[PDB]
Amino acid sequence: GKKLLEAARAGQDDEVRILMANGADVNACDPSGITPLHLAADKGHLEIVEVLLKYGADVNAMDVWGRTPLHLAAFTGHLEIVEVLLKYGADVNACDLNGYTPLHLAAGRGHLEIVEVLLKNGAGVNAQDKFGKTAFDISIDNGNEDLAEILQSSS
Amino acid sequence: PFERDISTEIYQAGSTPCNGVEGFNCYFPLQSYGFQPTNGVGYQPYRVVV
């Protein structure tokens, strides 16, 4: 189990392919609940995400803070990771402990394409965090005019 | 074994300092205690001594 997580953290293709073809669990995690897909979306290893989704990895990874693979896809700014995960059937309105939707993270992190591709899925523009703020408030805090326009267009 | 966890500060993961600023990855101090009025053992607090 730990070998798969370390190999995914190391960005290894054949190693993880052999490990998950050997019989190891695809959703092995540490006491902090770090799934292999969590690190795959963290470091932008596209082939790792593809292999995990093909072999049937979890789509609703849940760590201590409540982060999801799509949350880190929007946080780090990875192009096709979020696309393949939404093709898997990922939820769009997942709320973590802080209540920060992935759209809020993408807006605050300046990823226009991620915001738009989540918006196509049916993203909730009127989603609120634990403080009652929306993605528009975080965007205007970040001072992004074009992002504010594109978020207000669908609102 | 035989140690005390005394953390009078807040986390920072790898990037965002949180010294008096709203940090999105800095988390926050210890969460409070939900003394529910009348519920099951999941919300029935107990007092213990050693």
From Swiss-Prot, chain B:
Changing residue 39 to Y: Increased binding affinity to human ACE2. Changing residue 22 to K: In strain: Beta/B.1.351, Eta/B.1.525, Theta/P.3, Iota/B.1.526, B.1.1.318, Gamma/P.1, Zeta/P.2 and Mu/B.1.621; May enhance affinity to human ACE2 receptor. Changing residue 31 to N: Reduced host ACE2-binding affinity in vitro. Disulfide bonds join 18-26. Residues 1-28 are annotated as: Disordered. Residues 1-46 are annotated as: Receptor-binding motif. Changing residue 28 to L: Increased resistance to neutralizing antibodies and human covalescent sera neutralization. Changing residue 34 to S: In strain: Omicron/BA.1. It comes from the Viruses. Changing residue 22 to A: In strain: Omicron/BA.1, Omicron/BA.2, Omicron/BA.2.12.1, Omicron/BA.2.75, Omicron/BA.4, Omicron/BA.5, Omicron/BQ.1.1, Omicron/XBB.1.5, Omicron/EG.5.1. Binds to host ACE2. RBD also interacts with the N-linked glycan on 'Asn-90' of ACE2. Cleavage of S generates a polybasic C-terminal sequence on S1 that binds to host Neuropilin-1 (NRP1) and Neuropilin-2 (NRP2) receptors. Interacts with host integrin alpha-5/beta-1 (ITGA5:ITGB1) and with ACE2 in complex with integrin alpha-5/beta-1 (ITGA5:ITGB1). May interact via cytoplasmic c-terminus with M protein. May interact (via N-terminus) with host bilirubin and biliverdin, thereby preventing antibody binding to the SARS-CoV-2 spike NTD via an allosteric mechanism. Attaches the virion to the cell membrane by interacting with host receptor, initiating the infection. The major receptor is host ACE2. When S2/S2' has been cleaved, binding to the receptor triggers direct fusion at the cell membrane. When S2/S2' has not been cleaved, binding to the receptor results in internalization of the virus by endocytosis using host TFRC and GRM2 and leading to fusion of the virion membrane with the host endosomal membrane. Alternatively, may use NRP1/NRP2 and integrin as entry receptors. This is Spike protein S1. It comes from Severe acute respiratory syndrome coronavirus 2. The lineage of its organism: Viruses, Riboviria, Orthornavirae, Pisuviricota, Pisoniviricetes. The gene is S.
